[PDB]
Ligand binder design. Sequence first.
Ligand code: SF4
Ligand SMILES: [Ca+2]
Ligand SMILES: [Ca+2]
Length: 344
Amino acid sequence: PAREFQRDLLDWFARERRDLPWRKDRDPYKVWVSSVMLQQTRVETVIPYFEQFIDRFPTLEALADADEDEVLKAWEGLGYYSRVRNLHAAVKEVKTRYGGKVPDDPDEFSRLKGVGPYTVGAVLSLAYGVPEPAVDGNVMRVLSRLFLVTDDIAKPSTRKRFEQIVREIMAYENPGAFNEALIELGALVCTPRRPSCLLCPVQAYCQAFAEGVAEELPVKMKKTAVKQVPLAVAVLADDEGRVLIRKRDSTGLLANLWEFPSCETDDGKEKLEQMVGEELTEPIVSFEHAFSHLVWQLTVFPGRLVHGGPVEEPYRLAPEDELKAYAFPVSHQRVWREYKEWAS
DNA sequence: AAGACGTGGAC
DNA sequence: GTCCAGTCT
Ligand code: SF4
Ligand SMILES: [Ca+2]
Ligand SMILES: [Ca+2]
């Protein structure tokens, strides 16, 4: 019953829609930035980053024209940093190739780095009205419960089945609003735990609620335990208070972020002294830091730096006052905090 | 295919 | 502790 379902959903949306910062206009640049920031990141976390980012980068061209270091700093702490490297590249392409206009063609837009199926649907359906589905985790959960889809949603194929269902039940009249409303429904009503089925605008059309199994959907494979990785970190300061930091490679974990020199140890002090050579004191703190796919076990070693030559790349000698200008991962932000607390 | 890829809320 | 808010390879 598409029309009945749509009306109960979209009337709910008009009433309950959150007035979020990226909903102030249907501008493709701002829908694109927020769509990328929101990937694997909760709305409440994104709000301050979005506001600061758009303030610093009001247009696609200001983003394209900005130095990679400035764009990364604006992303500092949000996680999954290849999102912002892909976005930066993708806007650069859009300025270079397309004269600064965001393509409204799905296949041309998706050629851009970072633009996967959700981001295509989100930007094109809201900014330009293109009736492409925008299936995020919220939408998969909603559709799994509605149509009692018990397949693993982690499989790409399941996602392709959801995307077909959307095109069938979609309100082609108001696609942008249909897509936001499904997302918003999963965010506000059809939540992972204890979904508010009784309050839900579409309790009638839900096969899961009818069978009493809303809480058992969606079907998501259980995450496997992650590798543990010991990491020795040096905080090396000369007599002028300047600190040695380095820029990580553009490929892999925490790409192009700055860090304090570090070595995967699997004795730390010996490897660190050996690495920076190519004298440290005892450890001052040891803490863990989680990633999605591994856990760092960090150990911080204070050090003294005497200048015997030029500071070569990737390294840079940073006055303590100028550390604030570099983008560090959260793990190394804590390294610096613990080093400064110890110094007190 | 499924591992890589950050981080922080809410249970 | 578990869960979970997308894309590239
Ligand atoms: S009735 Fe419940 S399970 Fe079905 S769409 Fe609404 S909130 Fe989700
Ligand atoms: Ca794509
Ligand atoms: Ca690398």
